Amino acid sequence: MLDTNMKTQLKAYLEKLTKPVELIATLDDSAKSAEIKELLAEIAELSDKVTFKEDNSLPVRKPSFLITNPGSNQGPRFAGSPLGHEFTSLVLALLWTGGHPSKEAQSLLEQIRHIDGDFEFETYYSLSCHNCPDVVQALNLMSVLNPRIKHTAIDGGTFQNEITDRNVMGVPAVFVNGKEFGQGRMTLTEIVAKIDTGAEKRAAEELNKRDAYDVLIVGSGPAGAAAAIYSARKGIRTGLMGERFGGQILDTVDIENYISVPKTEGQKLAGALKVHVDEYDVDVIDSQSASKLIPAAVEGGLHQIETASGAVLKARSIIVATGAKWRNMNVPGEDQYRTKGVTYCPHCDGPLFKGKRVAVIGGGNSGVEAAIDLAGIVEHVTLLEFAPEMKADQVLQDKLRSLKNVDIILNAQTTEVKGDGSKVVGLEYRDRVSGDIHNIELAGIFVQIGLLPNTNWLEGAVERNRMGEIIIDAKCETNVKGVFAAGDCTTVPYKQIIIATGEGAKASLSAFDYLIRTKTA
Amino acid sequence: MLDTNMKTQLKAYLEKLTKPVELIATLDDSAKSAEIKELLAEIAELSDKVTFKEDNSLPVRKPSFLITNPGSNQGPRFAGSPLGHEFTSLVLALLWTGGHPSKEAQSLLEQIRHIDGDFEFETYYSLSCHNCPDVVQALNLMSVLNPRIKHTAIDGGTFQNEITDRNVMGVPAVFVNGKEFGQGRMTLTEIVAKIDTGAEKRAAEELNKRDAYDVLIVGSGPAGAAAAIYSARKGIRTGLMGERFGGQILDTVDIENYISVPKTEGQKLAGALKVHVDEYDVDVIDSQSASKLIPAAVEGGLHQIETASGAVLKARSIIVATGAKWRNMNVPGEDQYRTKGVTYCPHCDGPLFKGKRVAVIGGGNSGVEAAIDLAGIVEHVTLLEFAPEMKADQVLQDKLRSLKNVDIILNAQTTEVKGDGSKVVGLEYRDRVSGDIHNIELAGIFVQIGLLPNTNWLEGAVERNRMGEIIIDAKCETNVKGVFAAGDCTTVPYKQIIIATGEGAKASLSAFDYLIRTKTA
Ligand SMILES: Cc1cc2nc3c(=O)[nH]c(=O)nc-3n(C[C@H](O)[C@H](O)[C@H](O)COP(=O)(O)OP(=O)(O)OC[C@H]3O[C@@H](n4cnc5c(N)ncnc54)[C@H](O)[C@@H]3O)c2cc1C
Ligand SMILES: Cc1cc2nc3c(=O)[nH]c(=O)nc-3n(C[C@H](O)[C@H](O)[C@H](O)COP(=O)(O)OP(=O)(O)OC[C@H]3O[C@@H](n4cnc5c(N)ncnc54)[C@H](O)[C@@H]3O)c2cc1C
Ligand SMILES: NC(=O)c1ccc[n+]([C@@H]2O[C@H](COP(=O)([O-])OP(=O)(O)OC[C@H]3O[C@@H](n4cnc5c(N)ncnc54)[C@H](O)[C@@H]3O)[C@@H](O)[C@H]2O)c1
Ligand SMILES: NC(=O)c1ccc[n+]([C@@H]2O[C@H](COP(=O)([O-])OP(=O)(O)OC[C@H]3O[C@@H](n4cnc5c(N)ncnc54)[C@H](O)[C@@H]3O)[C@@H](O)[C@H]2O)c1
């Protein structure tokens, strides 16, 4: 039923065929199926690539024909007339199946080439309908790429029997596996979204496709936030990846040394940090953990960060700001009284305990200094050391034995934090030697047993001191060109919010200075 | 007229005499003056120190007698009876004048021993009055110490003539140089305040008397404020001296990078800094300039700071935080448009000039980097260099010549900042070679010609790099034990409020650590 106009175009279009096409028909003696025999044999006669065969004992509609390459039995199936408005749908099916490429976004085409679900699409059309080809062609494309996605386009003029049995007022009308899909306009892009609803949001593929960063900051505590703002203000492409925006301050409650702010709160300062950040062009990535730094193999090239989610980001410059974790005792009641008397930092919370009795857990330098600190502010201090002797510098140990409101207890293992449901009221411990249990009444417990920088993921790539801290010069420079670090994760002598924010800003200005110096062409 | 009780005490009290006393009388034949002859000769007869002479041609009241040491004619003069309630006033005058000491605050006594004004005090009393001795004795004491302060105590029973001529309803009643002074109760302490109303508030003597500080912080910008809060929170004795509380931020207007605070203002942040400070025990000294550090000559001893006012303060530890001054062009209109388009820092203000044309003044590193910075943010940048070539690292000069929105002008001396009464609209300059005048239209002028740390007052005492910055390690330690430094005055690579506050806190924690380590007895 091809008109001469269609023939000439079709002859011209089949000249753009690089693979051999076969049309496999299933026909039933009716004059409609005779009309489709004629057509297939007309088309076959127009090209040496195109062969018309027929197999009339297949479990598919009659009349219909599979378009395919030799051997393989995968491709678009038309039932009834592939003419009218669907003429250009038919040329396209032959072309694609014969090696011509899709004229649309190849990213989607790969996405489609990899899909797991088994889908038969059967679209219902009729020859008169103007808006039906775009849906037909769409789902045609799909059937060629992935062999799991089958597609039968159905002319309503030939199957009024199926039009009624299954209600179809209005075409086009598609039916994914004997189930209503959708009607009217649908672009391929739009089709593929809905089909992969039970998709799997590969946000790691989102991340892998991003452009290189001018600076990528790893860690979104105070240090990294501060660095993100200073970087964004220079207008450079800036990224800020971290596990949890706000770092340590988020789990903090009463904060009284953020300079200029007599009293604030962790959740609030963290929100204030997020607001300042969003005042600038900063791609904030949350809930994402860095697992490896790969240093650029040449100056002027790019460093890489690997995430635990399997993504890889790329940056002209990196800033590490991943902080530290204070070690816990891991005893009953420790959790329960976190921020209600059990604390870590003596700098931050010391003043809250004037007049009160406290304990320091840990006999290292950090614990011993902490006790000499608290001793001046508070009424009584009890230091408890797990080992049979204190580890701290002698100078400090003698100074602590000099004060009149302090007790040292050796071989003392804290077993329980006690409180009243609201606040700490005491401590239980055992003598690791005789096994004897003991009780202290107090209002505060300062755990000073070790800081652990979050840097074991950097082993081998940047240099660390012997406590795990990232070694930095005054400019926050690491031993790798174009990698800087700021905050508690580094060798800064002290760990405070106000100190960490200053270092992030430094690291940012140092990173910018390195970008502008990276030479020329 | 001495009764036997008075004699016995007086005999006992004159035994406490270390110098020779002379009573010089002026007497007029009346039986009152005969009554004072008798008395003087009774007293003379009670001690070998006390001699009674009389000179009856002196320009003073009759009867009266000067009490004094031989030769010299200075001391308390009584007119009429020095008896009744004023008996014990008389013993005291003889004792003090004969070398016995004042039983009251010797600080005041030195203050009084040094006074410049010429004062005759004449107090009016009468024998019956209970509250008159304390005023009489007070002003007696004064007359012995300083020889400029004369004092005649006047018995009203003998001079009813002067009681009426000069109205005196109610005693005691004192008259500094023929002029009403005061009536009723007056302590010496209270007398001396009022007499030195035209005193001179030696606030430097206030400062010289203060106890040693645990830490003395020099400079009350952000760095020193931050250090004062961290120090005070440890409860140590802390002092914060500076020229002007708030440092550089006070003259600053729009501040958009104080981390956590999207927009604040200089005068406000400075007030917020003052409030946080006053939340703790910090002796704030304002309007006071340090002129010299004298390092302790031994560990465990005290450093000293000399002020321009001549005061000297003492501290176990010092923190220097005296900042820097950006160099000005010193041209007409520079002042006028300070904070209205003329600025110093490109980090702070760069973002305000998106789309705008700007100039950078200065072809050093700081200027050239600044131009490469602004070039990315802004539409056009014009760098003007006073010399015939730029000074900056070559790397940077080539990078600046690489950009497409930049002009370099050599031998260019800015002559005028132009505006519209509100904001900068352009710049005038001369070619230092041909002398030709030129004009540029712009909205911003970034002056980048040199930072000058405020540290020339430290020459020789602590070590400085070659740009004048105080050399510090990561711990803010200087090359002198127990002296630390923080903020723009030091070698920190960048000068920002958030960076300076972090350094002040560091320097504080480092200073505290040094205090606790300073050994033992
Ligand atoms: C209970 C408590 C109370 C405190 N109170 C005060 C106080 O009153 N005042 C004060 O000044 N300081 C206080 N501090 C300390 C203060 O919070 C720290 O100085 C500050 O948070 C350090 O900031 P930071 O940016 O360097 O690191 P962090 O705050 O620890 O933030 C680093 C961030 O990076 C994340 N991260 C870690 N590893 C990775 C990775 N591989 N990839 C991506 N992200 C990663 C971390 O989970 C965190 O979110 C307190 C700390 C605690 C624990
Ligand atoms: C116009 C302008 C705008 C700025 N805008 C910003 C901005 O938007 N953001 C930002 O982060 N930074 C900004 N800055 C810079 C910021 O103010 C500095 O980083 C910061 O003030 C440095 O603090 P500081 O404590 O180290 O020293 P300073 O702020 O300079 O304070 C030191 C103090 O010590 C005093 N002093 C000096 N000598 C002595 C002495 N011998 N004895 C006693 N006291 C002494 C000084 O007069 C001053 O009061 C700006 C600076 C200027 C000039
Ligand atoms: N300046 C800082 O803020 C900072 C912070 C952390 C570490 N550091 C430095 O790192 C080094 C490590 O010193 P440190 O004191 O942090 O660690 P440390 O390992 O040297 O001392 C830890 C001590 O805790 C004791 N201990 C452990 N578990 C205990 C428990 N459950 N109960 C009681 N006692 C227990 C151990 O016996 C040991 O004495 C030092 O050089 C220190 O100066 C510095
Ligand atoms: N990182 C920082 O924030 C910081 C701040 C200040 C200085 N520095 C360092 O100190 C050194 C000094 O560099 P710098 O650039 O501050 O100073 P510089 O003296 O090296 O350069 C100053 C330049 O200004 C030019 N100049 C002076 N007056 C001028 C005028 N009125 N008009 C036009 N041009 C004029 C001079 O010709 C000279 O080229 C460098 O090593 C720099 O890195 C660093």
In whole angstroms, give the CA distance from residue B155 to residue A374: 65
In which order are the strands placed within the sheet that holds B406-409? B342-343, B444-447, B357-361, B380-384, B406-409
Cα–Cα distances in angstroms (integers) from residue B320 to residues A60, B6, B404, B455, B502, in the given order: 91, 65, 44, 9, 14
Where does B5-117 show beta strands of DSSP type E?
Answer: 21-26, 50-54, 64-68, 77-79
Instruction: Evaluate whether B164 touches B192 at the Cβ level (below 8 Å).
Output: no
Structure tokens at A281: 């062009």
Please indicate if any CB of chain B lies within 8 Å of the CB of A260. yes
In whole angstroms, give the CA distance from residue B15 to residue A118: 126
In whole angstroms, give the CA distance from residue A207 to residue A216: 13
Quickly list H helices, B196-311.
203-209, 222-233, 266-278
Coil/strand/helix, residue A207: helix
* Partner-chain contact B493 A510, CB within 8 Å: yes
Instruction: Evaluate whether B447 touches B326 at the Cβ level (below 8 Å).
Output: yes
Closest CA to B497 of A239, A493, A226: A226
For B1-200, CATH gives 3.40.30.80
The residues facing A319 across adjacent strands are: A217, A484
Q: Which residues in chain B are classed under CATH 3.40.30.80? A: 1-200
B444: left (phi over 0), alpha (psi -120 to 50) or beta: beta
Minimum CA–CA partner of B473 in chain A = A474
Instruction: Evaluate whether A178 touches A119 at the Cβ level (below 8 Å).
Output: no
In whole angstroms, give the CA distance from residue B474 to residue B461: 20
Q: What is the number of the ligand closest to the CA of B396?
A: 4
What is the four-CA torsion angle of B37, B39, B40, B43, rounded to 10 degrees? 160
Q: Residue type at A305? A: I
CA A57 to mean position of chain CA atoms:
51
Chain A interface test: which of B249, B259, B471, B501 (most A C-beta within 10 Å): B259
Q: Which long-range contacts (CB under 8 A, 24 or more apart) does A516-520 make?
A: A516/B369, A516/B372, A516/B373, A516/B396, A516/B399, A517/B395, A517/B396, A517/B399, A518/A299, A518/A300, A518/A316, A518/A482, A519/A299, A519/A300, A519/B395, A519/B398, A519/B399, A520/B398, A520/B399, A520/B402
Residue with tokens 């011209």: A12
* Surface-to-core class of residue A253, CB atoms within 10 Å of its CB (0-12 exposed, 13-18 middle, 19+ buried): exposed
- DSSP code of residue A232: H
* Partner-chain contact B279 A261, CB within 8 Å: no
In whole angstroms, give the CA distance from residue B179 to residue A63: 134
Ligand 2 shell residues, CB under 6 Å: B 218-224, 241-244, 247-249, 252, 255, 257, 289-290, 321-323, 326, 344-345, 348, 454, 457, 487-488, 495-498, 500
In whole angstroms, give the CA distance from residue A513 to residue A508: 9
Q: How far is A284 from chain B (nearest CA, A)?
A: 16
Structure tokens at B401: 């010549």
Q: How far is A472 from chain B (nearest CA, A)?
A: 9
A201-326+451-521 placed in CATH 3.50.50.60: yes
Instruction: Evaluate whether A127 touches A78 at the Cβ level (below 8 Å).
Output: no
Q: Residue type at B153? A: A
Give the dihedral sign, CA B188/B194/B197/B202.
positive
Ligand 4 shell residues, CB under 6 Å: B 329, 361-367, 384-387, 391, 413-414, 449-451, 467, 493-495
Residues of B in contact with A269 (CB under 8 A): 260
Q: What resolution, expressed in A, was reported for this entry?
A: 2.4
Structure tokens at A428: 């239980």
Residue length of chain B: 521
* Partner-chain contact B399 A517, CB within 8 Å: yes
The residues facing A47 across adjacent strands are: none
Structure tokens at A362: 């840990």
Q: Which residues in chain B are classed under CATH 3.50.50.60? A: 201-326+451-521, 327-450
CA B210 / ligand 2 centre spacing (Å): 28
Can you identify the CATH homologous superfamily of domain A327-450? FAD/NAD(P)-binding domain (3.50.50.60)
Cα–Cα distances in angstroms (integers) from residue A409 to residues A317, A363, A378, A413, A414, in the given order: 49, 10, 18, 10, 11
In whole angstroms, give the CA distance from residue B467 to residue A102: 66
In whole angstroms, give the CA distance from residue A471 to residue A476: 9
Give the dihedral sign, CA A187/A192/A195/A200.
negative
Structure tokens at A120: 């038969």
CA A362 to mean position of chain CA atoms:
39
Closest CA to A325 of A458, A459, A467, A503: A467
Query: Backbone phi, then psi, for A149, in 5-degree steps?
Result: -95, 95
Closest CA to A400 of B236, B520, B231, B509: B520
Cα–Cα distances in angstroms (integers) from residue B321 to residues B237, B243, B487, in the given order: 18, 11, 6
Q: What kind of experiment solved this structure?
A: X-ray
Count CB-CB contacts under 10 A for residue B110: 10
In whole angstroms, give the CA distance from residue A78 to residue A43: 15
**β-strand A342-343 against A444-447: which pairing, if any?**
parallel
Whether omega before A63 lies within 30 degrees of 0, making that bond cis, reads yes
CA B458 / ligand 4 centre spacing (Å): 22
Query: Backbone phi, then psi, for B160, in 5-degree steps?
Result: -65, -25
In whole angstroms, give the CA distance from residue A143 to residue A94: 12
Q: Which helix (H) or strand (E) holds B500?
A: helix B497-517
In whole angstroms, give the CA distance from residue A144 to residue A151: 9
Structure tokens at A44: 């076959």
Mutate to test the pocket of ligand 2, among B240, B459, B497, B508 (most ligand atoms within 8 A of CB): B497
Q: Which helix (H) or strand (E) holds B290?
A: strand B290-294
Instruction: Evaluate whether B276 touches B320 at the Cβ level (below 8 Å).
Output: no
Count CB-CB contacts under 10 A for residue B394: 8
Chain B interface test: which of A245, A252, A259 (most B C-beta within 10 Å): A259
Q: Give the closest residue (by CA) to ligand 2 atom 26.
A: B487
In whole angstroms, give the CA distance from residue B269 to residue B258: 9
Q: Residue type at B177? A: N
Residues 6+ apart with CB under 8 A from A457: A290, A291, A292, A293
Residue length of chain A: 521
Cα radius of gyration rounded to whole Å, chain B: 36
Residues 6+ apart with CB under 8 A from A180: none
